[PDB]
């Protein structure tokens, strides 16, 4: 290979630090709410070569893949893949991302607390659920 | 309040064959298998209790042993006591308990608070 002058060693995406020297799919896997399968599908829908690093890329690539990874359904990422398929409140198929995953998890725990079910009381004692 | 983006009044008008597009997998499998005689008996009992009640007052409690029962959106506002093997627990049907079984509202066991161990 060669030496890229426009190499970014550190990235800050969606309030998350990303190591640029690891490869791009596993680097965007390193954030909360995105795994390797989701990274590989969102990059294969972005028409980006998988062999490049997370610093050896152009910017318009990374904003385009960010726009795809927030909006999966408009980019033909289908309705079995997403984090939350039928949401309890609105029932919209939406993939949920770093901070929002924490907020939705705490929201579900709040819903269980309000409804006073056995699962919620088990979790609030700090025990095993499954 | 909304449930899968659906308001409760539409849920009250939501038809029976098309609530099989709205619940979770287990609930839809149960309602596709259909409810047995005892669950409809509890349904009729709750409907009688809600109908024969003062409007400003909460309806009278209905005691039951049914814990396999799934909460339909018709029941919101009814006041149901459910057995946990030893004691009835009195619970109000809220809007947010449509996707839940009754039995997880009355816990059948007591939490463990460990005492000092004996000779082991």
């Amino acid at each position: 290979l060669v030496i890229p002058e426009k190499f970014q060693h550190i990235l800050r995406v969606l309030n998350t630090n990303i190591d640029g020297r690891r490869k791009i799919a596993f680097a965007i896997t390193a954030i909360k709410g995105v795994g390797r399968r989701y990274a590989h599908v969102v990059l294969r829908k972005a028409d980006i070569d998988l062999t490049k690093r997370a610093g050896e890329l152009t910017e318009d690539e990374v904003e385009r893949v960010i726009t795809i990874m927030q909006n999966p359904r408009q980019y033909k990422i289908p309705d079995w893949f997403l984090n939350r398929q039928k949401d309890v409140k609105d029932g919209k198929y939406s993939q949920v991302l770093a901070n929002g995953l924490d907020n939705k998890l705490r929201e579900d725990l709040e819903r269980l607390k309000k409804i006073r079910a056995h699962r919620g009381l088990r979790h609030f004692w700090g025990l095993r659920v499954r | 309040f909304t449930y899968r983006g659906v308001d409760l009044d539409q849920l009250l008008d939501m038809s029976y064959e098309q609530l099989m597009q709205l619940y979770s997998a287990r609930q839809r499998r149960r309602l596709n298998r259909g409810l047995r005689r005892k669950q409809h008996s509890l349904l009729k009992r709750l409907r009688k209790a809600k109908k024969e009640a003062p409007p400003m007052e909460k309806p009278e409690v209905v005691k039951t042993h049914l814990r396999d029962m799934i909460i339909l959106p018709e029941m919101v506002g009814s006041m149901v006591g459910v057995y946990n093997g030893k004691t009835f627990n009195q619970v109000e049907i809220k809007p947010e308990m449509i996707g839940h079984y009754l039995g997880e509202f009355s816990i059948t066991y007591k939490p463990v608070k460990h005492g000092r161990p004996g000779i082991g």
């Binding site: - | 946990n84 004691t87 627990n89």
Partner: peptide
């Protein structure tokens, strides 16, 4: 701080 209709058998959990 106990709700209206619950029993002691469930109040051990609250």
């Amino acid at each position: 701080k106990v709700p209206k209709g619950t029993s002691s058998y469930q109040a051990e959990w609250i």
